[model samples]
Target chain A: AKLDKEQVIDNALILLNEVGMEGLTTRKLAQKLGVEQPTLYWHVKNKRALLDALAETILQKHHHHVLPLANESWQDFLRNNAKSFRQALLMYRDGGKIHAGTRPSANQFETSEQQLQFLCDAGFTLTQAVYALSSIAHFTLGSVLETQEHQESQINYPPLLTQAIDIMDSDNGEAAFLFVLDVMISGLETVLNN
Target chain B: AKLDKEQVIDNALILLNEVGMEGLTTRKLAQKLGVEQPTLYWHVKNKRALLDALAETILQKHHHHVLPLANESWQDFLRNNAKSFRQALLMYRDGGKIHAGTRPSANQFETSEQQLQFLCDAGFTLTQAVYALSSIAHFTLGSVLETQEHQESQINYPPLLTQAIDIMDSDNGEAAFLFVLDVMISGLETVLNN
Candidate 1:
């Protein structure tokens, strides 16, 4: 009632955008929210704990397709969920990194249970359903994050490498993400059939 | 030579295992190496620079299949490369995170270039080759690292979610990684065809 926990997280997320993960500090969050550092600690135990909350909140707020749509096919649901998940992580600077070390919080249990039920109904064994979700997450995160861009070639590189870098620069990460997404979905279909 | 740069990075990787990415500091690294802080700074500019060197060094030392072997098919090389890449990341604590913000270092150019030419010869455009690599790396890392493992259920959970957690615990991550690896390879084949 005094300081809403959610409001504090909301402020932390906003500060995340401005200062990034390394610069994000409890003392800073306290200042941003017009409170003392110890008061901020009353909610999140520490920086790592705060990040865990932020990661979970990012998914809850932005990852719309975590639950399947009514009568949506498993493939469609996974596709939508993957995209939403990626978008959620991409919503923040270091979003993927923020999510890396976290597990499903207690509040996520019912939602996760629903997710498993949906995938299990789609002919995946419980384990396969879990792996399916895990794979989407790993792939999405590994596509790389942080603002480290294509390296500036100090010397003239070969034509092929040069051309590849050029294409990479133009893509805005969508074409590549979509291409792999289709590949993974197709791969998932193959797994089911075989 | 006061401190070999590779030697500095080598020490850093060993230190990483003990202290992790967050605990890795120039001051601590200097302490470990028995040098003054200024001497360590002479080689790498700062902590971020030290990490970049560490990330790149991890791959250069561990990811042996970065290029195709003699008479290796493009697909085979990629499969080997992906496995090797994942293994490299797994070799260190917070390994995937270490690799995340880093670009292919200057030392990696020829190897990366060779990889592209090999794939291009096998009928991928240079861009497709790049995306394929990105997908594998992304998928491998996202399978989860930083080991904040399966959450303890504070309350009773339904059977489906329970079973899924059980399977996730048993898998050692290899099965899931291999499953998606196959899917992605098959996906690359699909992309090549269509």
Candidate 2:
């Protein structure tokens, strides 16, 4: 009767946004789907598998450009890649943690082949392409996981520290994201030259 | 009987190794330390405070030079800062998640002030200094949280993808890290010139 795997994944995501990574449970998800525990098991074997499915489904649904466009420069591709990746992970509670725990999805590996090949075709050595993508993914993954919380600055801290916190608290997200992106992109430029 | 705060924090860390953040409970920690829950309560109000103190204490014990050395270039200082910070976070199970959830510690802000001032003194504009440090922390935090697990690649992935996975599996750590560091530093150099 169409207990589609994706329907369960969709409902689980809704539950995830509500309960977060810590509280999400197979039992809870089963209840949400209006199905028994075994019915859920038919699809995902355990919490790890469930999360992997969630991560895979989340990426599939939210992100479009897993690979570079033919017309796009590699720099612009990475920038877009980071942005797409960052946005995808931000779509759920503990989304970054979710994606971080899983291995590259089947689709991810397929695209990695194409993306790596593309980078090499454009100019990067195999190692350079690997390094570039890893760094970008690491930075973006790091940024999203950390973004789930923020701290208020106390007035008593030393001036510059207070200033730094004030600076962080004020800008919200874009300025710093792009600043690091530039650093990463520029660094790649140096690598591309060598 | 001292029943010192530091003693409690230390025991909690030992327990944390056996049972990760998910299973870490105040009652369990109290049992580990041979104290009642209330006695443990006298030191840490709850897990949140416990984690913040853990994060603060961990960094203090493991890392120094949150500020630059007198002779250190801002770039070199950032490299060392990141390495030190990375090593500190790598010490515990879910240490990156622990640090990321808590706000910057008191000592962190105090040091942030000096570090920011030092960067400003060394030629980075205030915003530039903030961006560099944040990027370093984000990237390092991302890397550590991720390092806790790995997945082996299947032989079935496309050729280039398999090669990329092979490269990643072979890289225990350093080459990719320094490559990104170079990217970040290079990016900052461009900022400095502007």
Candidate 3:
């Protein structure tokens, strides 16, 4: 009677942050919650479903854009929305990886509808617009995964990077993230304009 | 009486191809080479060093151009190089991950030299050119990893290309990869010209 789905999801996220999805298990999660394994099982069907729910829940938290907002350009709104989503993905251990693996969540359709309208308003055919928006979203997720793992590798100054410059450019998360975003936006402009 | 150094590395690579790096071991390599484990230890020193050598061997098989080769424009040459490296990575099991983890081989130094030259010849400072080139390389490797993984995820697409576009407008790997490449090139053109 006492297990809050949010509480269960929270603990699951904690385990993900600490141990990653690879090592996560219901037994370990149950032990953390001080409940029997069946209690955990009752609330979440299995590991995959639990992970799906955790990812969906995370997105549902930050995705509150109004449909077709009047003031901001769609590109700006998309960039901001993507940045917020990326920030949320970075909040946990291997968060980017989790975000990378998830399918589009059913519960986030309102957010998707608002996002889709951006393309429609921008004069892309309905399908083209969705594809373009989706590319940005997927690439953002892809870029975040690479950025995190690239940091972890510690291989230091990729050969091409070392040769092309004299000193470290000193990238922090925000600037590098925007650098990639701007590149995508500019490309979209070229496509749309032509 | 024992296997030579190259022979041991060769077997290790074959084992890597078969079972991947995670399951690879000195004992397995020794058995595959029809030798004792100590014999392999004598040639290679350790598993990590063996991996580096294997990576070096693989990269050596491909052409890594130095700057100012015949007629290809800098853009075409760079794109070809990046695409070839991506193909090579895809050729191996967990290739991008493996390539990402390994140190750049000595063979790559010449390629680095050529890359710098190409940029300078094409109107960029050593610094700007390097950032441009490195961004492309990083983006290529990172984008390829996502593309490889996404290809394996088995999400269904509609039969026709247009239908597939309709289905995947939200998450098309091809669009993301191509768009980013275009953007980075265009962005660099803008920066270089400015």
- Chain A TM-scores, per candidate, are 0.89, 0.91, 0.82
- Give the DockQ (2 decimals) of all models: 0.57, 0.71, 0.22
Interface RMSD (C-alpha) of each candidate? 2.6, 1.5, 5.1
Deviation of model 3 at B46, angstroms: 9.0
B1-194: candidate 2 lDDT, tens digit per residue: 87998799888888888888778989899888888988888899887778778888889888775877778888899999998988888788778877874556665776777788888887888888888888998888877766664521113887876776666656545567777887888888887888
lDDT of 1 by residue, A1-194 (tens): 59999999999999998987888989899999998978888898788889889999998888777788888888888788888887887888778778875667677788889998888888987777877887787777666452222321116766677776665556546677787888888878877886
Q: Give lDDT tens digits, candidate 2, residues A1-194.
A: 77998799989999999988878999999988888899889998788789889989999889777888879998899999899988998889888878874556776787878888889988999888888888988898887766665521113877776776666666555577778988999888987877
Give the per-residue lDDT digits (tens) of candidate 1, residues B1-194. 56888788888989998988878999999999999988888888787788888889998888888888899887788789888988888788778777765667778888878888788889988778878877877677666463322321115667777776556556557777777788888878888987
Q: What TM value does model 2 have? A: 0.93
lDDT per residue (tens digit) for residues B1-194 in model 3: 64676677667767887986546777778788887767677887766567667766666665344344588877776666766665666666545545543545665765666677678888977766655555655566665555555554544422233343455534535565565566566666666666
Q: How well does each candidate reproduce the native contacts, as fnat?
A: 0.71, 0.75, 0.10
Q: List the residue pairs that clash in candidate 1.
A: A138-B142, A138-B143, A142-B138
User: Least lDDT summed over 10 consecutive residues: which range in candidate 3 chain B?
Assistant: B156-165
Off by over 4 Å in 3: A2-5, A25-27, A34-54, A61-70, A126-131, A138-142, A153-169, B1-69, B99-103, B154-172
lDDT of 2 at A191: 76
Q: What is the DockQ of candidate 3?
A: 0.22
